[PDB]
Write an enzyme that holds these catalytic residues in place. Structure first.
Site, short mmCIF file in Angstrom:
data_model
loop_
_atom_site.label_atom_id
_atom_site.label_comp_id
_atom_site.label_asym_id
_atom_site.label_seq_id
_atom_site.Cartn_x
_atom_site.Cartn_y
_atom_site.Cartn_z
N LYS A 167 0.85 -1.22 0.00
CA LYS A 167 0.00 0.00 0.00
C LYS A 167 0.86 1.24 0.00
O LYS A 167 1.86 1.32 0.72
CB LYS A 167 -0.95 0.05 1.19
N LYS A 186 -12.43 -7.61 -9.13
CA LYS A 186 -13.19 -7.87 -7.88
C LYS A 186 -14.64 -8.11 -8.14
O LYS A 186 -15.37 -7.20 -8.54
CB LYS A 186 -13.08 -6.76 -6.86
#
Ligand code: AME
Ligand code: AME
Ligand code: MG
Ligand code: MG
Lengths: 368, 367
Positions: B163, B263
């Site tokens: 991240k 996703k």
């Protein structure tokens, strides 16, 4: 100012005549109003959502909820507020543009009243009245549409706009063109009801000299509109797709649009609306003002907005009695097919307390 | 199926450790589960939504509201129903992809159970097991990062994903390259936090051979990414911009993406996720499976999806224990940097009631 709290109201108003689009039929309008309270004074916002998520994903219950549990609390936690600071303060929350623009409109209204300044003066108005068109729903029959289109033209509306959908398109415009002829400003609007598969059908509208066809394809489908443009003569206008100034810049860069409909709630606010106006102006793309069946609160702000220099086509900002027997504010009334730009501080109008109360369904106070 | 009703329940599960992305930190995971019930049997679905609208506009209470007042009634009103028909029945309703995807999953799982077919079979699986990667949050200090990744490598995660955000971008990746070297597969993920103005900064990641950078710019900014790709060496991967197979078709035509994170929930369901895979396959665009910190139901469906032929980069679909002390399902457990495709009919797992009930916060039946 500081932002003391926001009073949030649900209002239900009777329509004079049921309104039909490609996505459904309406005969009552359910809406949210917001009264922002600041040390400096009150302001009004209108939220442009409807009962269910049919024009876009936002709707009354959803907007009420984000407003009350995320957006308003965030503004209440802030050290300083101005209308310009609203966007950064709420940037952390994705989407909810119509909710965000309701709130921003209320903060803006409080802030300008406190400076005894017009929405118009703030936005950069350059004229004192604006030409108005009307938007005519889908009818059950061709003659009904003809009587109806005849009514609005007799009241002095300066342009006609016909809701369309597969099976109600070429016949209605031919009818309207046979009856009132070719000089009448005429345009259609699909509300995303076609697909690129329908280009041959939509080309059957070439010979009728329409001003524009508004959002023929789905909101995410921008390249599709650039494609369609290459196959039809009628200029393309985007409505649901233009969700920001950046959106408009992209659609123009891609050849997907020739004329933009600005609706403030849909872009997240009057402030962003003006930015759509300027981006379009810089690229040569005319814009026109849209309408969400607003009460006088929103109508006033839209009429102010419509008076900016690049509004070069008549908008959908019709008179109050086009929708409502009794507006909650001083009503707008057509004159030479114009509406006059409001003049006092702020919105230029305010709810008449007793009429508001008559139409209020629920009232709730959000403070600290 | 005729569909009897759906039991919608809210679940809260604690996290093994705080997970911090560019939009904030999380330490529990509130989620919604869905139980579709037919006269045959039942199916499960999970909504990938979070507590507030920080990753996208959808959020737990929003999803609960649509599901309850719009989505589910629309299904119950209908005559015969099938997973495929869910889409046209719900089309009327603009957006709410994650909500629609949960309900579709739940209905899929019913349809499939009655036909004793798994998710993998229905989706077009070609592998029995899939390689897995780990996603690593923003830490307070460089050593606290190196430590955590150190740990993940040893567990045998095949790839690391870091991240990032302004203030935490070139330094952490530099650090990870010194400790563990050029041979570990490494990628970063901005979750939206940069702008095109930060191009020179992201060009600074050039030297480190990242395999991709996930969603540097805003969701709505596809042209922006096409522009970025011209100013940096790292391949662009899109996550949040990719809301449908059409969206991928458009990002690929505009040259805005080289690799696509799928996703299921984000995109409106497993059935659409397959389409996205196929559109991406057709353009030579590699895809890899994303993770929304699902429970074991979500994970079971992901692992089946991630075994389609074009998923050729390792997915974010880590083992149950990477997020949870205890999972409401038989846990998924990393074996050889892999996880096994479920084998049962439908989703191939089910929540074990003893644990579900431990962790349920509220529950409503909709008939
Ligand atoms: C029932 S939605 C109102 C939306 C608005 N139409 C009306 C015709 O002004 C816009 O679609 O043009
Ligand atoms: C809980 S945040 C959203 C989930 C996901 N990231 C993790 C790394 O799987 C996405 O950012 O790729
Ligand atoms: Mg329109
Ligand atoms: Mg991501």
């Amino acid at each position: 100012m500081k932002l003391s709290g926001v009073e949030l109201r649900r209002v239900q108003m009777p329509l004079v005549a049921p309104f039909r689009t490609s996505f459904g039929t309406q005969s009552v309008r359910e809406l949210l109003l917001l009264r922002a309270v600041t040390p400096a004074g009150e302001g009004w916002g209108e939220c442009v959502t409807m009962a269910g998520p049919l024009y876009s994903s936002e709707y009354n219950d959803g907007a009420e909820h984000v407003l009350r549990h995320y957006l308003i609390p965030a503004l209440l936690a802030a050290e300083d507020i101005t209308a310009a600071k609203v966007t950064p303060l709420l940037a952390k929350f994705k989407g909810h543009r119509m909710a965000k623009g309701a709130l921003e409109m209320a903060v803006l209204d409080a802030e300008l009243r406190a400076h005894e300044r017009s929405f118009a003066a703030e936005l950069g108005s350059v004229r004192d009245s604006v030409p108005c068109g009307v938007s005519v729903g889908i009818m059950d029959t061709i003659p009904q549409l003809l009587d109806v289109v005849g009514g609005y033209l007799d009241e002095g509306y300066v342009r006609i706009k016909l809701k369309i959908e597969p099976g109600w398109d070429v016949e209605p415009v031919r009818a309207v063109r046979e009856r009132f002829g070719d000089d009448v400003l005429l345009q259609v609007d699909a509300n995303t009801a076609y697909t690129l598969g329908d280009a041959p059908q939509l080309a059957r509208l070439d010979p009728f000299g329409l001003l524009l066809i508004e959002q023929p394809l789905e909101e995410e489908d921008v390249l599709g509109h650039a494609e369609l443009a290459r196959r039809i003569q009628t200029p393309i206008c985007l409505d649901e797709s233009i969700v920001s100034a950046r959106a408009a810049a992209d659609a123009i860069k891609l050849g997907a649009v020739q004329i933009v409909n600005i609706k403030p709630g849909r872009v997240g606010g009057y402030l962003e609306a003006r930015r759509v106006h300027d981006v379009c102006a810089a690229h040569g793309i005319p814009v026109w003002c849209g309408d969400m069946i607003e009460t006088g609160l929103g109508r006033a702000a839209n009429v102010a907005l419509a008076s900016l220099p690049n509004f070069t086509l008549p908008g959908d900002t019709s008179a109050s009695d086009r929708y409502y027997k009794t507006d909650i504010t001083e009503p707008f009334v057509l004159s030479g097919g114009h509406l006059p730009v409001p003049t006092g501080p702020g919105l230029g109008v305010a709810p008449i307390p007793e009429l508001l109360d008559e139409v209020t369904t629920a009232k709730v106070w959000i403070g600290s």
